[PDB]
C-alpha cells in the first residue's frame, strides 16, 4: 500500500 501522509 502507500502511506497516508502525502509528500508534495
Amino acid at each position: 500500500l502507500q502511506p497516508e501522509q502525502p509528500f508534495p
Epitope: 500500500l1 502507500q2 502511506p3 497516508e4 501522509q5 502525502p6 509528500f7 508534495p8
Partner: antibody, heavy 124, light 115 residues
C-alpha cells in the same frame, strides 16, 4: 501563533465518562486532521485516535486499547475538538494531548502542533 | 503495526559535546516510490508537550536550531545534537508515519547534561 488549549481533565471513577476539549486558533481548523495522544505518568507517548476533515467524511480511527469506549468528534464552527471517554479504566490515567499537523503543508500524520495537555485520573 | 525501538535509554553528554540517539523500526519506513523516510523526532522537555524537531528523517522543523540533525534510512535512524546546550535536556521520541494508523512511537531516550 498556533494555539491548542485543552480543558475538561480531572478526576473520574472507573466506568464513568468524561469529555476533553481542545480549542484551536492560528490555522485552518476545518482542513486539519486532529489526533489525541496520551502519556501515562513516567511512560511514553501512545496515540489514542484521530478524526479526519469533514470533507473527508469525518472518519475516526482509534487505537486498540481504546476502541469501543472512546469517541472523537469535531465542531468546525467552534474550532473545538473533543475526546469523549467512556467505560474508563484506571489504565486510562494519563495526560491527554490534542495534536495536529499544519494543514497548509498537508501534514496529517506529522504532528506540528500540540496542546499543553490535561491530566485525567481514573480512581474510585 | 510498526514497532519503534530506541537506544540508549539514557544519555549524559558534556556541554558543547555531541549527543547521538538511535531509533529502529520493525520494518522499512523508506517507501521506494519516492525516496522519503516517513519518520519524525520529538523533543519533550519536563512538564511540556512534545515539540516536533525533525521529519522526513532529516528535514529540520522551522525555528529548530541547526545543532539538531537527523539521518538514517529504511529501518535505522539517528538524531544528533552536535553542540549540546543545557536547554536541550529532554526526552526525545521517534515516530513512524509510514503505515498510517496507528501512529506509533519509540520508548524515548533521556538526554541530560554531564557536569
Amino acid at each position: 501563533e498556533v494555539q491548542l488549549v485543552e480543558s475538561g481533565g480531572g478526576l473520574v471513577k472507573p466506568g464513568g465518562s468524561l469529555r476533553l476539549s481542545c480549542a484551536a486558533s492560528g490555522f485552518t481548523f476545518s482542513n486539519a486532521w486532529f489526533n489525541w495522544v496520551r502519556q501515562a505518568p513516567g511512560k511514553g507517548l501512545e496515540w489514542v485516535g484521530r478524526i479526519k476533515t469533514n470533507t473527508d467524511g469525518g472518519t475516526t480511527d482509534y487505537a486498540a486499547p481504546v476502541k469501543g469506549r472512546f469517541t472523537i468528534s469535531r465542531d468546525d464552527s467552534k474550532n473545538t475538538l473533543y475526546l469523549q471517554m467512556n467505560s474508563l479504566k484506571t489504565e486510562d490515567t494519563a495526560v491527554y494531548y490534542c495534536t495536529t499537523g499544519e494543514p497548509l503543508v498537508n501534514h496529517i500524520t506529522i504532528l506540528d502542533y500540540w496542546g499543553q495537555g490535561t491530566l485525567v485520573t481514573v480512581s474510585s | 503495526d510498526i514497532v519503534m525501538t530506541q537506544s540508549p535509554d539514557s544519555l549524559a553528554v558534556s556541554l558543547g559535546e555531541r549527543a547521538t540517539i538511535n531509533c529502529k523500526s520493525s520494518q522499512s519506513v523508506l517507501y521506494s516510490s519516492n525516496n522519503k523516510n516517513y519518520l519524525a523526532w520529538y523533543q519533550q522537555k519536563p512538564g511540556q508537550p512534545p515539540k516536533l524537531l525533525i521529519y522526513w528523517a532529516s528535514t529540520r522543523e522551522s525555528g529548530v536550531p541547526d545543532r539538531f540533525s537527523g539521518s538514517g534510512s529504511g529501518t535505522d535512524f539517528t538524531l544528533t545534537i552536535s553542540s549540546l546546550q543545557a536547554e536541550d535536556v529532554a526526552v526525545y521520541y521517534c515516530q513512524q508515519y509510514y503505515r498510517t494508523p496507528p501512529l506509533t512511537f519509540g520508548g524515548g531516550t533521556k538526554v541530560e547534561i554531564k557536569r
